[PDB]
Amino acid sequence: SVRLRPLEREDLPFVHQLDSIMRYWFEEPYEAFVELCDLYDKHIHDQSERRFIIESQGTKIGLVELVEINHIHRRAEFQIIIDPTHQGKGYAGAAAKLAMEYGFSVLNLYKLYLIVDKENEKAIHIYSKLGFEIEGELKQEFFINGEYRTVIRMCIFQPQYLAKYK
Amino acid sequence: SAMSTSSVRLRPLEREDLPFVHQLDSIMRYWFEEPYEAFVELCDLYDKHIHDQSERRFIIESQGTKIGLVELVEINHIHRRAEFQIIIDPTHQGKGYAGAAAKLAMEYGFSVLNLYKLYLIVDKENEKAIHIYSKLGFEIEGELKQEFFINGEYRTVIRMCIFQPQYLAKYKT
Amino acid sequence: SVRLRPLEREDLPFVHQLDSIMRYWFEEPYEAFVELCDLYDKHIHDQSERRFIIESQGTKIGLVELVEINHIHRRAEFQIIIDPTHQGKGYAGAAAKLAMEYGFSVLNLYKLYLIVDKENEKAIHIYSKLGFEIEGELKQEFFINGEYRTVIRMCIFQPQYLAKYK
Amino acid sequence: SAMSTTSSVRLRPLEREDLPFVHQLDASIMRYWFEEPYEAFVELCDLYDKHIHDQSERRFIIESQGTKIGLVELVEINHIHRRAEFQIIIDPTHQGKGYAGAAAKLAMEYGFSVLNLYKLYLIVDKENEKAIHIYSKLGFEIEGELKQEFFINGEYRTVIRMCIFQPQYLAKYK
Amino acid sequence: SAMSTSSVRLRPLEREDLPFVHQLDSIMRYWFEEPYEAFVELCDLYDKHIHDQSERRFIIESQGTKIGLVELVEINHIHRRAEFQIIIDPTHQGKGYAGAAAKLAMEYGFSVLNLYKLYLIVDKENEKAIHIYSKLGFEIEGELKQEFFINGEYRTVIRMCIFQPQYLAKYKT
Amino acid sequence: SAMSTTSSVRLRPLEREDLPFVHQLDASIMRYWFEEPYEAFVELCDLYDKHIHDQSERRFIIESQGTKIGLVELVEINHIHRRAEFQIIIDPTHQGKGYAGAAAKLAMEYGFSVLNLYKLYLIVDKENEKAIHIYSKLGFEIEGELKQEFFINGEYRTVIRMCIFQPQYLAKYK
Amino acid sequence: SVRLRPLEREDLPFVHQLDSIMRYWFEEPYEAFVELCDLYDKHIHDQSERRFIIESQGTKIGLVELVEINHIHRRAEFQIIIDPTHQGKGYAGAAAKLAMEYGFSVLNLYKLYLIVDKENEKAIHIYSKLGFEIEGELKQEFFINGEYRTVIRMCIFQPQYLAKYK
Amino acid sequence: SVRLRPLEREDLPFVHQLDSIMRYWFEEPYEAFVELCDLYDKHIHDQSERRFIIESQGTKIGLVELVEINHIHRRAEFQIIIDPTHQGKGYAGAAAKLAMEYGFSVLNLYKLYLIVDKENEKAIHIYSKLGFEIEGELKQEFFINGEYRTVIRMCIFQPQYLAKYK
Ligand SMILES: [K+]
């Protein structure tokens, strides 16, 4: 009984404290909370990204971000961030399921994909069990904490989903 | 060099290049990740984004005439990468301009912008472009499945990349 | 060898003279040319409607309007207007084919539909031969020239199109 | 290990609510926000609002044990040339405890490991041998001497420009 | 120093100092060469001119309480000069604050602003101020005749000046 | 005297109609207008409008015999510290004729005698011995060497900073 | 020991309640308090009119208005309004003296004038004793409470003032 | 038969070419013509300065600038600039007379003053003959062409003028 609800202004302090590492709101960087607030106001009607607070038993446990929503090509990227204090309880996989529900059954998308660090085998395994296939290995794609990291792109499609989970 | 495609250069895109840009193509086109069809839309977006350094464009010209466009997009200086696309006017295809311009795009990204990685996306069935980029030193990193709906069907694309070390070796001994 | 190209500001005088009867630009009425110009400027980046000049042998012969584009429900309405001087040559059906091509193969829509007067059997027949089924009869839906007219809504879907014309 | 000696000095992104702290870190010496001068608090606030999305400067409050002890400013961030200047200001009430050097290390970590810069540099008064020595021990080499470059308190002062590069850092601190 | 007027300093004017400013005085007063009477007018002008460096203001404070104002106006860095005025709250007159503050104003103009000349204007019949400024090293440069209409009559003013050499001598051995 | 040899090289204030000339003085090296980058002509025009009353930079067309031969840029004008950087650009078609040195003299005249500055300085590539020599003969002393300070054409270049002061000028050229 | 001080926003409620009869702020009419506030904001730096609260023993007793200030011709009109609860105590004449002081000794004007109803002999007498001569009788110049009223214009000049009161 | 007329936008190119030395429009510096144009637009209704083209026989021969107009203290500074090609013909003194006429007889000022270089005895003599007395010697008041110059302030008053020239 984990669910998604739309991000609201009053959720930003929660968002700000989920993490040193660049964060992006509508492809625009922010560090300070004030910067995040300003960007949140500036992009309020932009449908190219959508965000949801993940909540269980009324407490806020993480964030879902769909970004690069494109309805002509019918795809979006998604990212799940779980509050460090609620990690290791399979909320990530529960929320990934909800993100899939939303993208395929409300937004009418054909493809969802995601990016994870090559060395995050735990997440790679979770996404493989949910039905995601690996489509790409982006080499040295992000400079993080002094070193270039490699990421795996993974994807799933709307027919295989509206079968296996519907 | 002397008896050959020799005089190809790049210059910064200017407002008066837009009619040329508009006529290089059926297919959604994007200016700073914003769609346009009409020329008027393209003009408006061009004005709106004039100081944004996240994309940079160059007209390819040879013998004084405009023959194509280079687009570097998603320029990110923290990760030190960019995507690029070379578009050759259909009337100037088959004269080796794509590869000539690709070399100039690489020069610019690695030697002026100080990037570490450049990459590009091409249709899996664009063997001509795939071959050109393999000869220039690009390795294949990714096959993005059914990533674009074009002319009624989902197409698959190849992502290809080259890094600033392999470039400042292979073209800078 | 009839084709579609995107409407440009310089096409508005042509648009204005294709017709006494209310005309709409982004669901906003206009009569005078100046009103049409102003609305054209005001809505330039709005993707909820798209327009194309139909041209053959370099001369302008009509207009295609897709309106109420919705990418979540994946549909749009379309209207073909042929210049009175180029009617009776089957440009309407040629342009309807191009509108179908565009909506289904570029925009990735699932359903296109259109509205025609119940008494326009000639147009109803053309659209039936192109594969459109009748979905509705909207009774007394428009007051035109002193009387309430009834319209037929007709639709076609993207799988039957990407078979029969692809 | 349990038996280390370690400081809990850290850096966090500057916020609007940090400005009163910033303002009172120094009427006597011109201070600049995005290369624009300010004296009054009101002027600082206005400039802070005006420059909020500009990435050419980045600021961090230095804090230890949860209290605010200073400010780090990286300015003239240029990602094509891959460099930045930095300035450390330590609150006068927390001077003499090696926080400057501790914060300089954190500034280096951030510039080289987050921002992906190749060169960091700083400016100090030629007569500040204590600071010059600290920066020499952290790995900074002297690159030059800007003569009579600032009029401060009635006299033209000379400054030393010191620098460290991304290779010498990802060696000496890894 | 110990048993004396000792703790006088200058700090930058802030918005919350304006009520104090407004009540230091019959006489037109100017903020960035623009007149005001009402407090509301002063507030509005204060906002309107916040980043203008052609004037700079400091509250004079002693023992933590606000005792006056320093105004440097017509700051010109090409000619390297400024005019200044010291205003002491009437309730803190007769304690040597004017001369203490004048010294601080001189310090600021010559040692922080890098000015070559500071000058001031006082009524010809303000012998008290004339005397203080003569002792601080100011020479008389000008007698401006009937230069201000004040309280029904045309008053004559003395312009006085000191230069950056005579200052960084007399107060900086 | 009638029998002098003299150039009619002068400086006049940059105008909007000079921008096409400016634009074509150099796709290969980043150029800056009020510390803001531009490549396209349109971008240059926009920045020119946006900064028209800003006195922190001043520009002059160098002209001789009524034709435009180059540009002088004084940048980072600071009147509290009483200094400015300057850059001379000579049109490639008018190089090798000592206009750089002639224009540098005019730039000095203007900075010291109109702007009332105490220090002027400039930056040149360490490997440009020809320019270094010219500036040494005009009275500029070397103040330092900024190491690997610019990424240009695939490599990190080192620059020399050179300076002259208002006393040494109002001696040597009066 | 009655004095003048500059009108401030917080004096407007007092102003509004000193009076059915049109009132003007910078030659613009108002009835409601909100209208007065808006006009007060709109005209804050306009030196063509100046206003002063008349106060005695710290309580607000009336208003002085100088209007049509013209510094080339060196004149202004003034009006004294006394709160009805403080009338009949010669505050009007005390305030008129202060208005004269201000106009002639601070503003450097050459002529001040005022308008009063022809039938207000009490005010006419006060102003005659202060040195004002009658310059004009404006016939049927104001419609007030159903009838056209006639007004007397009265004036005094700066030399006769800087003699007789200085 | 030299006269004054109000400065107009179309006079700016003439103004720009009368002169290396800082010039001011409403106390704001300009060098380029574009800067002068922009400032001219920005200050069009500001009465604190007024400018007049001096013209004789229909050709433009110079400029009069009244600046720091203050109507409470009833004074202004003025500057005469004569085009170098029309110097040495006593247009300066003719224009100074017109500036006096305007300031005292139209603007109703009490005092006009001017600033000239101490070493410009020719101008000092002209102004002494017109009735100006020296009021001040401002020492090292302007840095010009590498050196600090000293200026003489000179003034004349409205009663002595409306006698001697009226
Ligand atoms: K700087």
Ligand SMILES: [K+]
């Ligand atoms: K700089």
